Design a protein around this nucleic acid. Structure first.
Length: 8
DNA sequence: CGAATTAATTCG
DNA sequence: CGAATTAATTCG
């Protein structure tokens, strides 16, 4: 995935 | 594993 | 609905 918390 | 990053959740 | 807090994820 990309950096940081995944978008929901 | 930690900081960094990024978004979700909480709570006024 | 926003700022503060919390959480999930990558990279070194």
């Amino acid at each position: 995935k990309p950096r940081g918390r995944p978008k929901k």
